[model samples]
Target: LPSTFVAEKWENFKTTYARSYVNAKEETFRKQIFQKKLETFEEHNEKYRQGLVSYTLGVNLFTDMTPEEMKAYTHGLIMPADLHKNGIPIKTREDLGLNASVRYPASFDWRDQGMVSPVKNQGSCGSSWAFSSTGAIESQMKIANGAGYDSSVSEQQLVDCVPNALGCSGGWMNDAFTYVAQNGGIDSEGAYPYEMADGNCHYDPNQVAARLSGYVYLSGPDENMLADMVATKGPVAVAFDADDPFGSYSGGVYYNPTCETNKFTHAVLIVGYGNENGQDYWLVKNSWGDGWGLDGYFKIARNANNHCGIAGVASVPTL
Candidate 1:
């Protein structure tokens, strides 16, 4: 859009983002895509400039991919509201019969508490549901045993063993939790390893790693209560609508004014909570690898009336 975006500058940007144009024919095709990405980048910057958005957007792995293609890599969440009735009874906040008056520290992080495992990459598969499910279980196991089983649980096990979930095609954290509760337990990532693709159930009872009694869905549109649960209980598995801006987000407290509040398309873990420059936010751990966002995590605007329906479908697994 300006002379500053000349060839040299563009080359630097591409190198930073691991984008390259090789071969005359392929270069010609990529040039068009790059131009489109530049246009979108300018638009996103304009929104930030106008204070219409909180996060900054930039050229990243999805820069050259079309919106639909970008969507392909992240589409895996199946919201609790959309889940079909399975034999296992779904529990709610009331079922826990706990005190909602629980107080928490001004800020809390599961990672700092040693409940969170390392950041992971889901690759091309849409098994974010599996990772989110396993992340919740992993945290619960650590909380249950006080670091006795503070290892990363297996997402591959859920991707392979959970019949209720459809693996890479798409799945639900609720179903994954149910599968674990019904089965004896799940294995650690080191034991099962991630396949990143769909396959037949290869679950082994001998490989049991972690188990959950059940899960409780938090009542939502109320982010304060969600934060209370997260700070007190542990990281919760939640679903949200991930639009284009979310796909290429690099940093800052993300806020999507136009994100869908009904249906969700991606699943992630809510690991902590804090405030940034007077803006309250939820610390979200994503499954798209450490290169994707702030070291595989991003903060979303919280207490702003459930932005992106983030608080709408949060569930914490019981230890």
Candidate 2:
């Protein structure tokens, strides 16, 4: 079988694949919310069985390009092996319980949709961390400056540029934030180009970065707070459940209640929030491209109650 096929097959068991038995209208509801076609449970499962999808967290990008370009652009671009060569421990989606004792709830709603793009998939690269940071900064920069600019910084630029940042092996969001903070921030994505391959250089201090004046922070899983944050802040950076089945997925049908928890293989931006019935929900903007998830976006239970371990944190520039 092809590698994607193998990955799809293995992911089901790992994610405890379940078709969201909670509500019969879940799929339909998602479709209405996103105003697009979403994959069915069976379709999603079959695709997994065929190894067509995956979820990983780190620095990543969902752009228009070939898989080879995707691979070359991402692989070792965010979490470099040398920096975190020893590897840092990651927690599962479950571990970040809505109320993990280690993580305290802050007053912020991280459930909102900021900028909407098609979709972004990171193949085998671990650049979600970079993407997450960039996504948040991208929108905030626009909001803060009143320019609402779509500054697409080079993930590859940060990858090859920043020191102490691990490209693909695995790294942290803080690394990306600090890198930009100290380096005078990054430029709009348009200003800096993406090479899809590694380059030897550092960020130009003169570039226009997306750093703002003030921001908020949240740790652990708290849905209400996220809703609140989204209401206030423009977009929030989020780390979600990623189970990388890493391969070709042409059909839509991905609904699994549980999985192997690739942990932090991806990062994304949450732009808006809303309430359906009495339940609160978050409107998330994903980089997976237009073909996947509610038009490159997904909705999750707000408050992420029921031991789902959902949390929202926001950062405003202090400048």
Which candidate wins on TM-score?
Answer: 1
Q: Give the alpha carbon lDDT tens digit for every residue of 1-319 in model 2.
A: 3445534543342244222424647544432322211223345555555765321111113211334544432233233433222222223323223333333333233322334332455445556666666667666655655544455565665666667766654444556665666666676556565554445765665676565333345543455555544544557766544443222223232223563233334456776765554445566666555545565565555553421223522332223
* TM-score for each model: 0.87, 0.57
Model-by-model lDDT, in order? 0.77, 0.47
Model 2 ranges off by over 4 Å: 1-124, 147-150, 212-215, 244-256, 259-262, 276-279, 306-309, 312-319
TM-score of 2: 0.57
Q: Candidate 1, which ten residues in sequence have the lowest lDDT sum?
A: 84-93
RMSD of 2: 13.0
Off-target runs (Cα >4 Å) in candidate 1 are 1-22, 79-102, 146-150
For residues 45-85, could you state the per-residue lDDT of candidate 1 as single tens digits?
A: 78877977778776666766766666646676655544522
Score candidate 1 by lDDT. 0.77
- TM-score quality measure for candidate 1: 0.87
